[PDB]
Write a protein that binds this ligand. Structure first.
Ligand SMILES: C[C@@H]1NC(=O)N[C@@H]1CCCCCC(=O)O
Ligand SMILES: C[C@@H]1NC(=O)N[C@@H]1CCCCCC(=O)O
Ligand SMILES: [Ba+2]
Ligand SMILES: [Ba+2]
Ligand SMILES: [Ba+2]
Ligand SMILES: [Ba+2]
Lengths: 596, 596
């Protein structure tokens, strides 16, 4: 079907041609007597391309068959240069197979015959695909670095192996070592390849970026390689002094910061779907960074912008609790008796008695919605959620306010449908602002205050909704929300299922109650389910760290969020510059640590 | 009472005859001087059958009494051939006891006297019953293989021990070794018995099947023997090549596949009540098999057949939401006022105004029900549940549709009783189709979507039911379900106990509400209980694997389910054939693995 089933067939088709071709069969079985009987007399095709376009030397290189390979090179030395003419292995030579098998004597003999150390194995098997179990690159030097054979690495360098070489994906030999499972052993091989660098400050091998704009140091962070990241950190930190147990080390903090403006480590961790990369922001050069960004500047501006959004939403409800005003006027209350509508769509906006208080309030709800769009719509052009789906809700909230404006100036009967949606999307987006937090126990009390915030926020978005839903309808029948102080008290009682369903079907309710109350039943249970997991997940195991860690990543994702749109006069740059004094120009972070 | 209490008495009755018989007493106590005083002068019964029909040599063989046994064989060599004449040990000879005790010098002396190596111990103690603590077989070669004494095994083979021998249950010496507790040590003894095989490709000892049609390789899977299964897998896998860390091994995949058509490993694991056998489908030759069967062919046809069943059930409700139509007609609403029935049984089927849309819809519900019976009724003749009780519900669903047809064409008043049952059995059988799934966390979100699917499926089966239950009755009193958009909204509110019981007892409700709402109260709580265990069982321990594993077996049981009835043109055979190319005819699976 796909090809996974194809190659399965080609590998079987390979063994079929090996079984058939006696030259390829003797190269596999290492039949030395059968190779001289075959090459010297009885005249054969020594350039015999097998199933996978392989030579007899390729088969003798796949199964360590040194005695059989040396026969194929002394009788026909042209077989060394021949690559795999197939599509699965296009570009692979006999040297690539000898390097991965760590055959030192075969590599020593292949280089003695003059093997190309720059042959790119562009075959489909060597691609960086999930259906390929290993990704080693294309050049034979990169294969030697990935197998951990330091002898073959230097033996290739001695024959002119360019460490500056990049594969099809723009990865140097340093990038490929970071994508290897054996993290603790790849650090040893990483230092061997750096020793053969040009020794010049310009055109450094560690600075050659990926095709996706990623230096090797920057790649270890996006990939969550803890061992390589700590190892690469040794090369970019300077110990200032040692005062006994203290070690006031100075970290580089260059490629771990903004402007690239896409090009930072922090942005790449909070926006990637790789869970494993989360752990990088906990390392000793990075954990001190985001902690200072959140203590000052971060936490205050979060609450300053939080209180601004709290007032911006309570003003929207202030214009809705005293919504616009009509008696039914129409005699349609006699036909279709089920209906209870006392619709208000009294357009006649300009009664000036007190309204002008509402009017300037309605003007605030408009100028704030476009401002929300003026900071989020130009941002979608340049999307992940660990922040919380705040961005998704804050744009749909300003969408409902503008529709209510278009709902207005046309005198539409369905005023209530778009206006009620902006009430929940405005409040329940506030509970996002609960992240304003700096032990098995005070963790129970800490997550409980999360619920009291999220609960009080939800009921203030549905009680104002349920009020509008039944402020127009008749309060004699189904009057759970006849005024505001009892609409909040009935919805609060609703939140704990102590009161029965505000339904009453002798009389037909509006199309919005059968929709708004349905969502109030799911959120009121998920918040009551998210509270039990807080209460129990705190104590049953050290999961609480697992519960803990992400909120911390949620705050880190929010901390990067608050630094993108805020101007330069507020929120100064982290670290200290190095231009006068002395080390400029990169901004460094002074960190001291104690040891026990 | 039973016999367990019997033999308890015979073992005590044995020691009673041993205590009494001085010949049997001296054979037990190894009294050499008392045996010559007893056999040479003072003339005794040397063929003295004890309580369990044992000879004096049998007692001297039960307690390692070599000095006492050699006396009983030099003075009466006929005691060797004598078996136990009792019923508990019928067939056991003095060699069987010497082999299990691993008495090498007694076995060497019993074979020197000419002991039968083919004597079958058919006694009731040697049976494969749960009340027997060991099952070693019948032949003395099988006893030597089970005790792990490789010296006695070969010593018996040297005297003509037939390894091809089978006991009463058709088990060779290989089958019995797999049913042993010491799995890691039985692998050593398994290779010893295979070495003495005929060496011919035909009539192989590993191919001799059980009496229940089970080769030794096939038996290790049904019994969950992980150690033996991996060991027996070495003999049916071929390594194609080694490309460094990769090892592209080719597995046999013969006796692990269909047609036998009862005779496969997969069918035997998903249908057995043995929990332990579940672990076999996780081994490295098998885990790659069912994974490819589910990615392609498996998952799409599951959802293709799933969407077909979703439309087949929503069409059934489409014919019920607009059910057939009568005003009460009858003046019986004045007597028995409690009743609210506005019964509709207006037979007069052929009003053609729109009905013909319903009529062809009712025709679909019939032709689909018999098709369900045409694929499940011929299957019950040839029953386990890890799939899920889908099969049990899908036949009872088509049973209710046919009863509604018989309910029709007779004008029965109880139309509603069989028709309402098909609504829940049709939807709640859909939630089975939730198995369409490809970490502590995304596991919480993964099991939560299980609930949202199962919840939305249940309410769509009871809201349509509660509608029919009260579509006939008066909606002024107890009108929770007067139309469809409010029958769904009231049942959804019912699902979370926010609304009060749609009961109203001033007025008598139909016999079906007091039954349908009772089942809606149990399922709505079990699904809310199955959600809490998902939420907490994910995180408190690695149980989530335990939670995880079975769903995986549920999918494997479903994957075998979808391959039985589907034709041959769809769903091609797994693996690659071996006829041209080369290895034919068995279908092999190409598997490569990386090592770190
Ligand atoms: C074994 C095959 N026979 C051969 O001559 N080259 C192949 C080497 C296999 C390497 C597969 C590495 C990968 O998965 O991409
Ligand atoms: C001890 C008994 N005395 C004897 O002469 N044979 C018996 C041997 C007991 C073996 C019981 C094995 C079983 O449980 O089946
Ligand atoms: Ba009335
Ligand atoms: Ba309750
Ligand atoms: Ba109640
Ligand atoms: Ba009355």
């Amino acid at each position: 079907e796909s090809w996974a089933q194809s190659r399965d067939e080609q590998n079987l088709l390979q063994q079929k041609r090996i079984w058939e071709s006696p030259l390829l069969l003797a190269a596999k079985e290492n039949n030395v007597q059968a190779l001289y009987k075959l090459l010297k007399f009885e005249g054969c095709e020594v350039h015999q391309k097998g199933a996978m376009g392989e030579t007899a030397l390729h088969i003798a290189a796949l199964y360590d068959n040194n005695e059989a390979a040396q026969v194929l090179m002394e009788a026909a030395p042209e077989l060394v240069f021949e690559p795999m003419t197939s599509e699965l292995y296009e570009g692979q030579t006999a040297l690539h197979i000898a390097v991965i098998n760590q055959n030192v004597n075969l590599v020593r003999a292949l280089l003695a015959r003059g093997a190309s150390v720059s042959a790119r194995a562009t075959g489909s098997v060597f691609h960086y695909r999930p259906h390929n179990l290993i990704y080693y690159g294309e050049h034979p030097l990169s294969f030697a670095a990935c197998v951990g054979s330091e002898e073959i690495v230097r033996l290739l360098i001695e024959h002119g192996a360019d460490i500056r070489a990049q594969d099809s994906l723009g990865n140097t030999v340093l990038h490929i070592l970071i994508l290897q499972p054996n993290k603790t052993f790849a650090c040893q091989m990483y230092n061997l390849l750096l020793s053969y660098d040009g020794g010049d400050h310009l055109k450094s091998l560690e600075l050659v970026p990926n095709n996706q704009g990623l230096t090797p140091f920057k790649l270890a962070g996006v990939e969550g390689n803890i061992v390589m990241f700590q190892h690469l950190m040794q090369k970019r930190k300077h110990i200032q002094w040692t005062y006994g147990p203290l070690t006031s080390t100075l970290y580089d903090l260059t490629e771990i910061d903004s402007s690239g403006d896409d090009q930072s480590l922090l942005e790449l961790i909070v926006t990637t779907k790789k869970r494993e990369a989360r752990q990088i922001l906990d390392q000793t050069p990075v954990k001190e960074l985001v902690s200072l960004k959140w203590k000052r500047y971060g936490r205050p501006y979060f609450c300053v912008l939080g209180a601004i959004y709290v007032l911006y939403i309570i003003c929207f409800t202030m214009c809705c609790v005293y919504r616009p005003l009509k008696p039914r006027i129409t005699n349609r209350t006699n036909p279709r008796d089920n209906t209870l509508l006392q619709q208000k769509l009294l357009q006649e906006a300009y009664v000036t008695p007190k309204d002008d208080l509402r009017l300037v309030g309605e003007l605030v709800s408009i100028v704030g919605a476009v401002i929300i769009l003026l900071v989020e719509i130009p941002d979608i052009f340049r999307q992940t959620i660990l922040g919380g789906p705040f961005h998704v809700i804050i744009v749909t909230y300003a969408f409902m306010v503008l529709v209510t404006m278009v709902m207005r100036l046309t005198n539409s009967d369905g005023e209530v449908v778009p206006m009620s949606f902006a009430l929940v999307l405005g409040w329940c987006n506030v509970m996002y602002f609960a992240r304003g937090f700096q032990m098995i126990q005070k963790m129970i009390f800490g997550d409980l205050m999360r619920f009291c915030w999220q609960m009080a926020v939800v009921i203030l978005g549905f009680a104002s909704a349920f009020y509008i839903i039944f402020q127009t309808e008749d309060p004699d029948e189904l009057g759970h929300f006849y005024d505001y102080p009892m609409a909040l008290f009935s919805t609060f009682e609703l939140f704990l299922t102590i009161i029965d369903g505000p339904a009453n079907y002798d009389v037909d309710l509006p199309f919005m109650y059968s929709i708004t109350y349905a969502a109030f039943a799911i959120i009121a249970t998920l918040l009551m389910l998210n509270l039990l997991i807080a209460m129990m997940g705190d104590t049953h195991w050290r999961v609480a760290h697992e519960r803990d860690e992400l909120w911390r990543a949620q705050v880190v994702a929010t901390t990067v969020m608050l630094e993108r749109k805020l101007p330069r006069c507020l929120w100064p740059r982290s670290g200290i510059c190095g231009r006068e004094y002395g080390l400029g120009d990169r901004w460094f972070l002074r960190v001291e640590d104690r040891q026990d």
